[model samples]
Target: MKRVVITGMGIISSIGNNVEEVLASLKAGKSGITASEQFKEHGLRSQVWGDLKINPEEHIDRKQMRFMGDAAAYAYLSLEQAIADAGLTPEQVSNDRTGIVAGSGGASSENQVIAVDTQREKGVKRVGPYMVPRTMSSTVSACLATPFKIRGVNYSISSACATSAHCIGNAVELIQLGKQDIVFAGGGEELYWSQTMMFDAMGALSTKYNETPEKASRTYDADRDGFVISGGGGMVVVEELEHALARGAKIYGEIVGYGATSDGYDMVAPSGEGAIRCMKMAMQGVDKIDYINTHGTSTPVGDVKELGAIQEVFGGNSPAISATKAMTGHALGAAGVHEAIYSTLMLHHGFIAPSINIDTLDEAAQGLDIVTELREQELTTVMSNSFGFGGTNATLVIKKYQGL
Candidate 1:
C-alpha cells in the first residue's frame, strides 16, 4: 500500500481568509463568532454566527461564480489556494491522475430560498436556469472538477458534520490503492438565515450569549448552551508519497489513520460508545498523541459526552485537547475539514491554538488537559475528531512528516 501525505492546505473561515491569516488568528486566540442581525430579524433562537466576509466575485470569474452555491463558492477558492500552495502547474493537475473529493451538508439553503421566493413572487418560469446545479449537495465537488479538469474519481460525501472527514478518508483509500496520484479533499458550508433557522428549530443553537457573541460558543464550559452556526471551506492536497516526492512537493503531514463509525442509537443524540471506539481505532499502534482538536460543539450534552469518551480512552494520560469551534463556531458539514486544516497547521507551526471562552469547565472535563490558552509545543502526532447528526462519527490521526 502506498503512503498518503498532505502536500498543501487552504482555509476560508470566519477568523481568516487564508493560511497566514488563520495562523495569526489561532495564535492570538481570536473569536470569529458575531451577532447576526439578519438572524435576529428572522426571529431565530440563535443570533450568533461565524460569518465569512468576502465577495466571491472578486476571486472567481463572474460566469463561474454565477453557477456556484454559497458553499461551492467557498470550496472553489479554497481548492485553488490548495493547488497553488502545492506548487502544481496546470499541466500537472489537469490530468487523469488528479481528482477531487469534497463534501457539504446539503444543497445551498440560500439558493433554495431564492428559488422559492422567486417562484412565489414572480413565477415558476422566472426561476433561473442554473438553480438546480447550484443548489445540489454535490455542487462543491462537481463544480470544482470542471474548472480544475480533474479526470479521476470525483464526488461528494455527505455525512452531516462528518462529511469532510469521510471525504479525506476516502481520498486516502484511493491513493493507497493506487487509484489516484493526487486528490483535493475537504468540505465547505454556508451560513444563511435559512440554515441557522433550521438549526435553531432543532434547539441546537446558542441563544444566551447573543449580546456577547464571542463568548457564545463556549465548548466544555459549564454555561454552554449550544453550537454557533458558521460556514466556510477548507481543502488539502493529498498525494501519494512517491508522487509528491517526484515533484519535490513539501510534505506537511501523513494521514496515518482514519476511523469512522456510526452510533446506531439516535439521529441527533451522540453515543460515547461509538466515539470511544472511533478514537481507539484512530490511535491504533500509535504510542502518544500530543494534541487533539475535538468536535466540541458547546451543546449542553455533546461537550460532556465527548469529554467522557476522551477520558475513557486516555484516562490519566490524556492529550492536550482544544476545541477550535470555541473560536471558529460550528461550520456544520465543513467542521471536519476545518478541524483537519487547523490540526495540520498546528502540527507544522509547533503551537496549539487555544479553546477560548471557557469561563468554567464542565465537571465531566475535569482532569482532562484541555488547552484554553495558546501553548507552544513541538508536536509529532495529533488527532482530530468529528461527530455529527445521523449518529455519524469520524476520527483522523495526523503526524508531522519526516522524509523517508
Candidate 2:
C-alpha cells in the first residue's frame, strides 16, 4: 500500500482559533474551559466549551451561510485553513482528485431544536425552508466540498466520539488505494442546549466542579469526577507521500498505521480485550512508536479502560501519553482530530504537553508515563487512540516524515 502523509491542519476549539494558537495554548499548558453562559438555558451541571470566537458570517458568504448549521460552519472554516496550510492552490488539485470525509454526531441538532421550537411556539409555517439541509449529519461533508468544488468522494462518518479517527483512517485507506490523491478529513461538533440536556439525562457528564470549570476535566486523575461538555472542530489534509513531495508541500507526518475494532459487548462501555486488539493492530503495522495522544476524557471508567488497553499493548515500555481533553474538554466527534493535531505537534516540536489537572495518577494508571506536567522530549513516532461509544475503537500511528 502507498504511504499517506499529513500536509496541513486546522482547528477551531476553545483553546484557540487555528493551528498556531492551539499549539501555543498546548505548549503553555492552558486550559480552555470556562463557565458557560449558554449552558444556563439547559441547567447543565457543567457547561465549559471551546466555542469559536469568530462569527460564521465573517468566514462564509451570507447566502451560503443560510443553509448551514454551526457544525457545518466550523467544518467549512477549518477546511479552508487546512487547504491553505497544505501550500496548494485550488487549481493544483482537481475536483475529482480531492475528497472530503467528516466525522460528526450532533450535526445541526442545535438548529433543528431552534426550528422546532419556533414552529411550535409561533406557527407551523415559522420554520425556514432550509431547515432540513441545515440539520442533517451529511451537511458537514457536503458543505465542505461545495465551497471547494470538490466532486470526488463526499461522505460523513458517525462512530460516536471516535468519528474523526474513523474518518481520517478511511481517508488514509482511500489514498493508499489510489482512489484519491488528497482528502480533507476531520470532525466538528457544537454543544448546545439540547445536547447538554441529553448528556445530563444520560448522566454522562460531570457536575462536581461547576464553579471550577477549568479543573473539572481531570483525565486520569485519582480524584477525577467526569468529562466537561465541550465542542469544536478540527481539519487536516491527508495526501499521498509522493504526491505531497511532488507538490513541494511541507509534510507534517506520515500516517503509517491505522487500526479499528469493535467490542460486541455494550453500547457505552468498552471491552479491554477489544481495545487491546485494536492498539496491537496499530502497533503491529508501525512496529515502533515514541509517544501517544490518548482519548482520555477523564471519566472514571473510560480512563481506566483506555489506560489498561495501552498497557496491554505496550507492556511496561509504553510510550509517553498525554491527554488533551483535560485542556480542550471533551469535544465528542471532534476529539479525534483535535488529538491527532496535538500528536503531530508533539512530533514536530519534540515535546509532550502535560495532561493538565492530573494531580495524582490513579492506581490503575500507574506504569504509564502519563504526561501530567509539561516536559520536552525528542520523539520520532507518535500514536493517537480514539475510542467512542458503541464499542468502536480506532488507533493511528504517525511517524516523522523522512522523505527529503
Candidate 3:
C-alpha cells in the first residue's frame, strides 16, 4: 500500500483569511464569531455568526467570479495557496495524474435566491445565464478542476458536516489504490442568511449569546447552548509520499489513518457507539494518539457524547483535546477540512489552539484534559473527528513527519 502525506495547506475562515492570520488568532485565543444584524433582520433566533471577511472579487478574475459561488470562491482562493505552497507549477498540476475531490453542503443561497426572485418578477429570461452551473452541487470541484487543469477523478461529496472528511479519506484511498498520484481534497461552505435559517429551524444554533457574539460558541461549558453557524473553506494537497519527496515538496504531516461509519440510529442526534467504533477503526496500529481536534460543536448533546466516546476508546487515559469550533464556529460541510488543517498545523507548529469561551466545564467532561489555552508541546500523532447530522462519522489520524 502507498503512504499518503499532506504537502501543502490553505484556509479562509472566519478566524482569518490565510494561514498566517489564522495561526496568530489561534495562539492569542482570539475569536471570529460576531453579531450579525442580518440574522436579526431575517428574524433568526441566533443573531451571532462566524462571518467570512474576504471579498472574492479581489482574488478571482471578474469573469470567473461571475460563475462562482461563495464555496467555490473560497475553495479557489485556498487551492491557489495550496498549489503554490506545494511548489507545483501549472504543468505539474494540470496533468492527468493529479485529481481533485471537494465537497460543499449544496449550492450557495445567494445564487438560488437571486434566480428565483428574477424568475418570479422579471420572467425566466431575465435571470443570469450561469445559474445552473453556479448552483450545481459539484460547482466547487468543477471550478477548481478547470483552472488547475486537474484531469483525473474530479467530483464532490455531500455528507452533511462529514462532507470534507469523507473527501480527504476518499482522496487518500485513490492514491493508495493507484488511481492517482496527487489529489487536492478539502471542502468549502457559504455563509448566506438562508444557511443560518436551516440550522435555526432545527434549533441547533446558539441564541443565548447574541450580544456577546464571541462568547457564543462555548464547547464543554456547562452553559453551552448550541453551535455558532460559520462559513469559509480550506484545502490540503494530499500526495503519495514518494511523489512528494521526489518533487522536494515541503511536507506538513502524514495521513496515517482514516475511518468512517454510520450510526443508523437517528438523523440529527449523535450516537456515541458510532463515534467509539470510528475512532477505534482510525487508530488501527497507532500505539497512542497525542492530541485530538474534537468535533466539539458546543451543542449540549454533541460535546458530552463525543467526550464519552473518547473515554470509551481510551478508557482511563485520553489524548489532549480541544474543540476548535469554539473559535471557528461550525462551518458544516467545510468543517472537517478546517479542523484537519488546524490539526496538521498543530502537529507542525508544536502548539495547540485554545478552546475559548468555556466559562465552566460540564460535569460530564470534568476529568478530560481539555486544552483551554495555547499549548506548546511536541506532538507525534494527532486526530480530528467530524460527525455529521446523518449520524455520519469520519476520523483521520495525522502524524508529525519524521524521516521516512
Candidate 4:
C-alpha cells in the first residue's frame, strides 16, 4: 500500500478566504461570528452565524459562476487554489490519474428557493436551467471532474458534519488500494442558509447568547449552548508519497491513519463509546499524538460526549486539544477539513491554534489538557475529529512530513 501525503490545501471559511489569510486569523484567534445579515429577514430563534468574509463573485469568474451556485462556486475557487499551491500546471492536474472526491451536506438553498419560486409564480419554463446543476448534492464534484479532467474515483460523499472527513479518509484508501495516483479530496456546504434554521427549530442553536454572538460558541465550557450556523468549503491535494517526491511538491504532512464508525442510534445524537472506538482506531500504532482539533460545536451535550470519548480512548490522558469551532463556527461539511488543514499547519509551523471563547472548562472536559490560548511546540503527530448527523464519525491522524 502506498502512503498518502497532502501536497496542497485551499479553503474558504468564516475565518478567512484563503489558506494564508486563514493562518493569520487562526494565529490571532479571530472569530467570524456576527449578526446573520443573510438571514436577518427571517424571524428565527437564532439570529447569529459564522458568516464568511467572502464575496464568491469576486473570487470566481462571474460568467462561470452563473452556472454554479455558492457551494460549487466555493468549491471551484478553493480547488483552484489547491492546484496552484501544489505547483501543478493546468496540464498536470488535467490528467486521468488525478481525481476529485468531495462531500456536500445539502444543496444551495438560495438557488433552490429561486428555482421553485420561479416555477410556481411564473412557470416551469421560466426557471433557470442552471438551478439543478448548481444546487444538486453532486454538482460540485461533477463540475470539478470535467474541468480538471480528473477521472479516477471521482465522486462525492455526504455524512452531515462528518462529510469532509469521510472524503479525506476515502481518498487515502483510494491511493492505498491503487485506485488512483492523486486525489483532490474536499467538501463544500451551503444549506440554503434559511433552511439551516432547522437547527434553531430543533433547539440546537445557541439563542441565549445571540446578544453576544462571539461568546456563544464556548466549546468545552460549562455555560455553553449549541453551535451557531455556518458554512464553507475546503480542498486538499493529496498524492502518493513517491508521486509527490517525484514532482518535487512541497509536502505539508502525511496522513498516517484514518478511522470511521457510526453510533447506529439517533440521527443527531452521537455515542461516546462508538467515537472512542473510532479514535482508538485512528491512533493505532501512531505514537504520542501531541494535539487535537475536536468536533466541538459548543453544544453542552456534544462537548461532554466527545470529551468523554477522548478521555476513554486515551485513558484520561489528553493531548493539547482545541475546538476550532469556537472561532470558525460549525461549517458542516467543511468543518473537518478545517481541522485537517490546521493539523497540517501545526505540523509545518510548530504552533497550535487556540480554542477561543473557553473561559471556563466544563467538569466533564476538565481532565483534558485543552489549549485555551495560542501555544507553540514542536509537534510530530496530531489528530482531528468530525462527527455528523446519522451517527457517523471520522478521525484522521496526521504526522509531520520529514521526507519519505
Candidate 5:
C-alpha cells in the first residue's frame, strides 16, 4: 500500500474563522457556544450554538453564490485555504491526479426550507431555478472539482456526524490503491431551523443550562446534559508520501490505520461494543498510540458508550483522551474532520488541549485520564474517533511523519 500523509489543513468554526484561530482557541481553553440569532427556532430548549460569524457572500462570487447554499460556500472557502497551505498551484498538480471528497449532512436543507416556504406562501413561480443545486448534498464536491479541474474522483459521504472521517478514510484507501496522487477531503455543515426542530422533537439537545452557553457542553462531566449544535467546515490536503516528499512539502502526519464498523442495533442510540471494535481496528497496525481525540459530544449515553469503548480497546492505562467538541460544539458532519484536524495539530505541537467545561469526571469515564486541563506532552502518534447515527463509526490512527 502506498503511504499517505497530510500536507495541509483548513477550517472554519464558531471558535475561529480559520485554522490558526481554532488552534488558538483550543490551546486557550475557549468555547464558542452562544445564543442563535440567525435562524428562528421558537420554543426550542437549547438555543445556543457555534455559528460562523462571516457572511458567505464575501467569500464566493455573486454569480456562483446564487447556485450554492451555505454548506457549499463553507466547503469552498476551506478548500481554497487548504490548496494555498499545500503550496501547490492548479497547474502544478495534474487534474486527473487530484480528487475531492466532501461530507455534508445538511447541505442545502436551509435553502430548500426557505424555497418551499416561499412557494407555499407566494406561488410556484416564486421558487428559484437554482434551488435544486443549492440544496443537493453532492453539490459541494461537484462544485469544488470543477474549479480545481479535479477529474480523478468526486464524491460525497454522509455518515451523519462521522461523515468527514469516512470521507478521509475512503480517500486514504484511494491513495493506497494508487487511484489518485492527492485528494482534498473533509466536511462542512450549515445548521438550520429544521435541525433545531428535529432535535427538539427528539429531545436530544442540551437544555439544562440554557443561560450559560459556554458551560453547556461539558463532555464527560458528571452533570452533562446533551450536545450543543455547531456548524463550520474542515479540510485537509492528503497526498501520497512519495509525492509529498518529491515536492518537499511539509507533512503533518501519516495515515497509518483506519477502522470502521456498524452497530446494527439502533438508529440513534450507540453501542459500546461497536465503538470498541472500531478503535481496536484503528490501532491494529500500530504498537503504541500516544493519544485519542474522542467523539465525545457530551450527551449522556453517547459519552458513556464512547468511554466504555475506549476502555475496552486500550485497557485501563491507555493513551490520554480529549474532546474538542467542548469548545467547537457538535458540528455533525463536520465534527469528524474538526476532531481529526485538532488531533493532527496536537501531534504537530506536542501539547494536549483540555476538555473544557469538564468540571467532574463521570462515573463511566473514571478509568480514563481525560485531559480536562491543559498539559504539555510529547505525542508521537494520535488516534481520532467519530461515531454517527445509524450505528456507523470511523477511527483513524495518525502518526508523526517520518522520512522514508
Candidate 6:
C-alpha cells in the first residue's frame, strides 16, 4: 500500500471563504452562526445558520449553478482553490490519474418542497425539465469531474453527516491501493431553511437560543439543546506520496488511518461502542493522539456519549476535543470534510480550534479538555471523527507530514 498525503485544501464556510480565512477564523474563535430570516419566515424551532457570506449572483454564473445547484457551486469554488493550491495543471490532471468524490445532502428539503408544491399548484406538466437533474444527490461529482477531466474513482458519497469523511476515506483507500494518483475529496451542503423545519419536525434542533444564535450550539455543554443547520463546502487535494513528491507539490499532512464502522442498531441514535471501535481502528498503531475534532453536534443525547467514547479510547486520559459546530453550525454532509481540514491544519499550525459556548461540561465529560479556548499546542498526531445518521461512523487519523 502507498502512503497518502494531502497537498491542497479549500473551503467555503460561514466563517471564511478560503483556506487562509477559514484557518484565521478558527484561530480567532469566530462564530459564523447567525439568525436567519428564512428560519423566522418558516417559524422553525432552530433559527440559526452559517449562511454563505457572499452574494451568489456576484460570484457565480447563474446557468452553471442551475445545473449543479448551490452545493456544487460552493464545491466548484473550493475545487478551483484546491487545484491552484496543489499546483495542478490542466495537463497534469487531464488523464486517468485523477478523479473526484463529493459528499452532499443529496437533494435539499427545499427541492422536495418545490417539487411537491409546484406539482400541485401548477400542473405536473408545468414543471421545468431542470428540477430532477438539479436536485439529484449525485450531481456535484459528475459536474466537477467531467470539467476537470479526472477519470478514476469518481462518485458521490451519501452517508449523511459521515458523507464527506467517507468520501475522503474512500479516496485515501483508492490511492493506497494504487487506483489513482490524485483525488479531489470533500463535501458540500446547500441547506435551505426548509431543512431547519424538517430537522425540527424530529425535535432534533436547538430551540433555546433563537434570539442568541451565536451562542446556540453548545456542544458538550450541560445546557446544550441540539445542532444548528448550516450549508457550505470543503475540499482537499489528496495525492499519493510518490505522485506528489515527484511533482514537487507542497504537502499539508498525511492521512495514516481511515476507519469506518456501522452500528446496525439505530438510525438516528448513536452507539458508543460503535464510535469506540471506529476510533480504535483509526488509531491502531498511533502512539498518541494530541487532539480530536469530535462529532459533537451539541445534541442533548449525543455530546456526552461521544465524549465518553473518546475518554474510553485513551483509557480516561484527556486529549483536547474541538467541537467547531459552535462556530460553523452543522454543515450536514459537509461536516466531516470540514472537520478534516481543520484537523489537518491543527497539526501543521500547532494550535487547536476552540469549542465555543461551553458553560459547563456534562458530568461524564468532566476529565476531557473540551477546548473552549484556542490552545496553542504542538501536535504530532491528531484525529477527526464523524458519525452520521443511519448508524454510520467514520474516523480518520492524520499525522504531521514527514517525508517518506
TM per prediction = 0.98, 0.97, 0.99, 0.97, 0.97, 0.96
lDDT of model number 5: 0.85
**Which scores better on TM-score, 1 or 5?**
1
lDDT of each: 0.90, 0.84, 0.90, 0.84, 0.85, 0.84
Question: Model 6 compared with the native: what TM-score?
Answer: 0.96
lDDT of 5 by residue, 9-42 (tens): 9888888878888889888989989887643346
Leading candidate by lDDT: 3
**What tens digits encode model 6's per-residue C-alpha lDDT throughout 77-194?**
8888888999888987677878898869655556667878989999888777767655778866866776677777778998988999999999998898788889999988887876
Clash tally, candidates in order: 0, 1, 0, 1, 0, 0
Q: lDDT by residue for model 2 over 1-404, one digit each (tens)? A: 79899999988888888988988999998988888888865677666665566677887897778878877888778887888898867774446888989968778778877888998899868786888768887877877777777877999998988899989999999998899999999998876878777877788787787788888888988888778877778899999888888878999998888889998888987887788888877774565678888888888898998888888888888888888888888888888888898899989888899888877879987878888777888788899988888899998888888764
lDDT of 2: 0.84
Clashing pairs in 3: none
Candidate 5 segments exceeding 4 Å error: 38-41, 92-94
Residue 122, model 2: Cα distance from true site in angstroms: 3.7
**Among all windows of ten consecutive residues in candidate 6, which has the lowest summed lDDT?**
55-64
**Candidate 4: tens digits of C-alpha lDDT, residues 162-185:** 988999999999999987888999
What lDDT, from 0 to 1, does candidate 6 have? 0.84
**Model 5, poorest ten-residue lDDT window?**
36-45
TM-score of 4: 0.97
Error of 6 at 287 (Å): 1.5
Backbone steric clashes in candidate 4, count? 1
Q: After superposition, how far is residue 96 of candidate 1 from its true place, in Å?
A: 0.8
